[PDB]
Structure formats: C-alpha cells, structure tokens
Design a protein around this ligand. Structure first.
Ligand code: NA
Lengths: 181, 76
C-alpha cells in the first residue's frame, strides 16, 4: 500500500543504500557508487596518517586495521552517507547538535531525517504536510503523526540510537507533487 | 588556547582547550559543543591516532594546531 511512494525494501544488509534511495525517492545510489565513496574516504584518512611517514610504526599499524567506512560485512559509515548526500547539495548533522538546537526549529518543519538504530540505517521524510517512516525493514511507508515526530527522534538519548537531520532542498519527485497543496 | 578539528566531510571545529587536557577531555568538549559522542570520534594528529589517556602536551599540540576528526558509526 501507498504505491505512489518510492520505497526500496530491504535486500539483506544494503540499508545505507535503501536509506539514501528512499530519502531521495528513487534508485539514486548503487553498490559501486558507495564502495567508491568509502574507498576515497579511506584514502583520505591514509593521507592524513602518511603525514607521519610511511615507514613509521604508527602508519604501518594503521594499514593493518579495517576500514571505518566499509567493513567486511558491507556496512557503510556516517561519512559515506555524508558524502553521498553532498552529491545532491545536502548537509547532515547530529539532530542533537547544540547549534542546530538553538535555532528553535520545530522538527515537524524539517523535511528529512536519517536514523541509526543498532547499526541499521533508515529514513524518515515529509511529503506535502505528512511525515512518513521509510524504513527498509517495513512492509511499506508508514505515516508518523506530527504529535509523535519529535518524540520519535528523541530516541537519540538511548545508546542504541543516533538521529541525524538532513538539511537542504531534496530533489523533486512524484510523491511531493502528489501530496502537496 | 585555540585548536582546530577538521573533519573529512567539510566541517572544521574551533575548540578552546589547554595543553594538559587529555584526548579524553577534548572528545568530551567536542561532544559538548557539537553533540558528537566520544565513541564516534577518532582523532588524528601528525600521523598518529591519539590515545584517550594522554594529553595534548604529550603530543606536542600547540595553539593553532589542526587535528583531524574521523567519525565512527556504521550501519547495515
Ligand atoms: Na546516542
């Protein structure tokens, strides 16, 4: 149900990709795009470590460590999500960011959030005046009522949850155009 | 004194710290200021991942120094 909403359901562990694709509302991102984003982030970190000499103990020990951006189970990191969003002019920050919080924005007036629960990425976004849960682990998109949204995001305080707000003009899509007034 | 913490994703954070501050304390400052929890922070300076129990002084970090902040959070 809710067929006019784009909702990419969960293939195994590719949750970063479903999260982003569901936020932007289409097949924007593929496994090769995200692996390349992680590989470049890895190379950026290596460069910072090479500042100490590629012969130093610390540098060599570092090369014997797993990637922080794409692990051997295929999980992608917050840095990869960040850089994929920049493609589209979008910035992402911890919802609990104190500077953002001082703004006094009612979360109901944002347009998209990304959550991390127990190492699973999902998107929540607004179409027209309506908030939807677009979690890939869900039969389909689900309404979240305004009275609930803030409370939903406040799960942050739990050790399990990290909640991010995505700022910027999302690309246009049939769901926004249909649900606007 | 003032130091700078540059992420890999655009943002540079400007902190007020002291040389006797431990990397642990600095990460807690970054949490206070930016809301990034210490567990999600990897700090790098001059080629070395900084250890929580040691001080900026131990690492020869001075005014205007630039650290690098790698964020650790994965999902799926
Ligand atoms: Na948390």
């Amino acid at each position: 149900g809710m067929d006019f909403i784009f909702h990419e359901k969960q293939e195994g562990f590719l949750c970063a990709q479903h999260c982003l694709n569901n936020l932007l509302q289409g097949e924007y991102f593929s496994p090769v795009e995200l692996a390349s984003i992680a590989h470049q982030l890895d190379e950026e970190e290596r460069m910072r470590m090479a500042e100490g000499g590629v012969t130093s103990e610390e540098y060599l020990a570092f090369l014997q460590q797993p990637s922080e951006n794409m692990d051997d189970t295929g999980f992608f990191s917050i840095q990869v999500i960040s850089n994929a969003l920049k493609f589209w002019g979008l910035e992402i920050i911890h919802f609990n960011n104190p500077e953002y919080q001082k703004l006094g924005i009612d979360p109901i007036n944002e347009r998209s959030f990304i959550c991390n629960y127990k190492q699973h990425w999902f998107t929540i976004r607004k179409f027209g005046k309506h908030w939807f849960n677009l979690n890939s682990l869900l039969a389909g998109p689900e309404l979240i009522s305004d009275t609930c949204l803030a409370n939903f995001l406040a799960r942050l305080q739990q050790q399990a949850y990290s909640v991010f707000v995505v700022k910027g003009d999302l690309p246009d899509c049939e769901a926004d155009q249909l649900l606007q007034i | 004194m003032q130091i700078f913490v540059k992420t890999l994703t655009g943002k540079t954070i400007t902190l007020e710290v002291e040389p006797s501050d431990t990397i642990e304390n600095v990460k807690a400052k970054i949490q206070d200021k930016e809301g990034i929890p210490p567990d999600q922070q990897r700090l790098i300076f001059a080629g070395k991942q900084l250890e929580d129990g040691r001080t900026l002084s131990d690492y020869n970090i001075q005014k205007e120094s630039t650290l690098h902040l790698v964020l650790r959070l994965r999902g799926x």
